[PDB]
Amino acid sequence: SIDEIYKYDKKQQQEILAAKPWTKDHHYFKYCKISALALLKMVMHARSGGNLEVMGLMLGKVDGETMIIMDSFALPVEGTETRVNAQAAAYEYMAAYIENAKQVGRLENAIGWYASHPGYGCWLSGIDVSTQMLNQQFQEPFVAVVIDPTRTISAGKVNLGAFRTYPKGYKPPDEGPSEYQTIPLNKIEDFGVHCKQYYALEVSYFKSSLDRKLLELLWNKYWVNTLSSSSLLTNADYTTGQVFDLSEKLEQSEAQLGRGSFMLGLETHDRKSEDKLAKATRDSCKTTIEAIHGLMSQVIKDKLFNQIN
Amino acid sequence: AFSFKKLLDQCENQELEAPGGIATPPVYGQLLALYLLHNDMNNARYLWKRIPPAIKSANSELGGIWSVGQRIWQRDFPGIYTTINAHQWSETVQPIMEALRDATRRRAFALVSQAYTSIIADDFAAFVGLPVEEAVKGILEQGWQADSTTRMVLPRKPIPNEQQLARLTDYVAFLEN
Amino acid sequence: PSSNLLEQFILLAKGTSGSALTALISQVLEAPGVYVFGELLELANVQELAEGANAAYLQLLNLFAYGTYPDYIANKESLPELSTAQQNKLKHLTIVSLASRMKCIPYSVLLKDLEMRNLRELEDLIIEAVYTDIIQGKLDQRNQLLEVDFCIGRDIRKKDINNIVKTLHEWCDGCEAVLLGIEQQVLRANQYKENHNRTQQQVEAEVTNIKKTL
Ligand SMILES: [Zn+2]
């Protein structure tokens, strides 16, 4: 059932919020499901911000290890945040909008915050980490989503990440692919200082009626120029960096395996090594299938156009 | 060529199903001749070693074909053509020996064209088993260059959409699961 | 303003005709801008010139409508003597016919079809045609090739309508074939997904059976 996810069960949410399973595991939340509406709104806000960072709130819910997102809304930022934080008259519009949604139907409460990084990638800065750590202390089920309007245009695919922080003092396990990202020199220092204080969630969608309609319409409308070359992957950057990350991860796994071959009776090492190899394989397979799809479209369209008759 | 391959397959089958374990001399002669046609020197050499000496002594033609095969192994084309045209081949061996001679001509013609940017006219004449002069007119009509002063020859070196769609679909099916 | 001038002469041709019309047609062949002559040919007074005694100008106009420069050279005895503008216009029209068939025109073909001796004036003719929005493309002097990306069309003797219909039918058949191929690929992908689901359900059934066994 495509529309099953849109059903809101208030008592079930209250039961989950009373249970607090995330207190039993700091890696509890692993997946982030984002609605088409949410994605579109967030991307539009980020690109209207242009080269300036904007932010908003995300409405949604939790389901097992998965955090869901549905909505998002701007807060009065008089004089581009002339006061502390991008809030000013924040919950003024927020609480009104919230009571108004309890009135017109929307009952999904705050599930997180989104912020934009125009032209400098998706990750959490020191300020972002402090903000998310605070959000993980009051509204425990919160997620820091970062978007990139400039990379959305450059690479073609929307650059989006979902993140959760670790509590002060707590160390992550050895397991950690950590995809490589191009970070400008004015941001790389802060990135490196805080990159191990949080982790990235797996961001996934679920199709839907919102998708079906939106996608079909805009697609036909603007894709009459269906060519757009055919390979926006031609830019080395993305592909090259992904392949480099894969190589690094696999070489690290090999170094581990070589040292673990001496220790007889370490099952955990074998477990993490197998998992890392498997993650590397799936990442490579997704890249390969994307390239294959691009080639398929290119070949079909080019053959149709050039020598049809 | 296609008929020769069919004959070779039939002759190979007849050798395997030999009642007394030995094939008739015509079958062995055809088998040895057809191996030389395809330049399958290893199979021809092993078949010759397999044949008992009784047939070799009772059939001097079989030894003559082996001598031709030995010349083919050494790749001495003037000797190969001389040995081919020296021994009288029976009605079952003359047509295939002529095909072997034609195969040698094409093999030598292509071999010179590839590895020899410039070759002496006498050397090319020896390679093709023909005297020099009409060999020159044979290659001039072939669009080649020949220098009369130095007697040097300058030879001139010469997927459907459905299959692609099937291969791409195989890509996708393999990477999907 | 060529179209407006063309329409005004069309309106004038509905009335005054004869030697004035022939001189008017000659002015059309001399006035730059007019690259389409089919509208003039459809006028009833042009058909009046067909039965009229004078035919040199009509055969001249007919050649500009469908013929090319080499045909005009052969007809130097039957056609009125052209002007510099008339010759350039015909040469531009001939280039249009040449560029219509092949998108890459070697300089050898250009020097042959248009009686072109000097290559310098050939470039002048080419750039003049491009600058007057007749043909669009790029020139490759190292390879001596004329790459034409886009060019204007020409009129039709009502005999190329069959060729147009055949080309459109071939395009429709090719599009339908590609659509059927895409549908077949979609069906094959669905079958592969069904096979994968069958393998998964077989695995889960085997697992459940062993769980029940123990
Ligand atoms: Zn940030």
From Swiss-Prot, chain A:
Coarse class of the primary localization is cytoplasm
Q: Which cofactor does it need?
A: a divalent metal cation
Q: Which Pfam families match?
A: CSN5_C, JAB
Q: Which InterPro entries match?
A: CSN5_C, JAMM/MPN+_dom, JAMM_MPN+_peptidase_M67A, MPN
The record's comment about this protein's domains reads: The JAMM motif is essential for the protease activity of the CSN complex resulting in deneddylation of cullins. It constitutes the catalytic center of the complex.
Q: Which family does it belong to?
A: Belongs to the peptidase M67A family. CSN5 subfamily.
Record's miscellaneous remark: The CSN complex is associated with some 'Lys-63'-specific deubiquitination. Such activity is however not mediated by the core CSN complex but by the BRCC3/BRCC36 component of the BRISC complex.
Descriptive protein name: COP9 signalosome complex subunit 5
Upper classification of the organism: Eukaryota, Metazoa, Chordata, Craniata, Vertebrata
Swiss-Prot record, chain B:
What keywords are assigned to this protein?
Cytoplasm, Nucleus, Phosphoprotein, Signalosome
Q: InterPro entries recorded for this chain?
A: COP9_CSN8, CSN8_PSD8_EIF3K, PCI_dom
Q: Which residues form the PCI domain?
A: 1-158
What subcellular compartments does it reside in? Cytoplasm; Nucleus
Q: Name one GO cellular component term.
A: nucleoplasm
Q: Where is the signal peptide?
A: none
The superkingdom listed in its UniProt entry is: Eukaryota
Name a biological process GO annotation.
protein neddylation
How this chain assembles, per its entry, is: Component of the CSN complex, composed of COPS1/GPS1, COPS2, COPS3, COPS4, COPS5, COPS6, COPS7 (COPS7A or COPS7B), COPS8 and COPS9 isoform 1. In the complex, it probably interacts directly with COPS3, COPS4 and COPS7 (COPS7A or COPS7B).
Q: Which family does it belong to?
A: Belongs to the CSN8 family.
What the protein does comes down to: Component of the COP9 signalosome complex (CSN), a complex involved in various cellular and developmental processes. The CSN complex is an essential regulator of the ubiquitin (Ubl) conjugation pathway by mediating the deneddylation of the cullin subunits of SCF-type E3 ligase complexes, leading to decrease the Ubl ligase activity of SCF-type complexes such as SCF, CSA or DDB2. The complex is also involved in phosphorylation of p53/TP53, c-jun/JUN, IkappaBalpha/NFKBIA, ITPK1 and IRF8/ICSBP, possibly via its association with CK2 and PKD kinases.
- Its protein name is COP9 signalosome complex subunit 8
GN (gene name): COPS8
From Swiss-Prot, chain C:
The signal peptide, as residue positions, is none
One GO BP annotation is:
protein deneddylation
Tell me the keywords, alphabetical order: Acetylation, Coiled coil, Cytoplasm, Host-virus interaction, Nucleus, Phosphoprotein, Signalosome
Stretches assigned to the PCI domain? 1-153
**Which residue stretches, if any, does this entry annotate as coiled coil?**
182-214
Q: Which GO terms describe its cellular component?
A: COP9 signalosome; cytoplasm; cytosol; nucleoplasm; nucleus
> Where on the tree of life does the source sit, at the highest rank?
Eukaryota
Subcellular compartments:
Cytoplasm; Nucleus
Cited function: Component of the COP9 signalosome complex (CSN), a complex involved in various cellular and developmental processes. The CSN complex is an essential regulator of the ubiquitin (Ubl) conjugation pathway by mediating the deneddylation of the cullin subunits of SCF-type E3 ligase complexes, leading to decrease the Ubl ligase activity of SCF-type complexes such as SCF, CSA or DDB2. The complex is also involved in phosphorylation of p53/TP53, JUN, I-kappa-B-alpha/NFKBIA, ITPK1 and IRF8/ICSBP, possibly via its association with CK2 and PKD kinases.
**Assembly behavior:** Component of the CSN complex, composed of COPS1/GPS1, COPS2, COPS3, COPS4, COPS5, COPS6, COPS7 (COPS7A or COPS7B), COPS8 and COPS9 isoform 1. In the complex, it probably interacts directly with COPS1, COPS2, COPS4, COPS5, COPS6 and COPS8. Interacts with EIF3S6.
Its family remark reads: Belongs to the CSN7/EIF3M family. CSN7 subfamily.
The protein's name is COP9 signalosome complex subunit 7b
Q: Which organism is it from?
A: Homo sapiens
Full-protein residues shown = 7 to 220 of 264
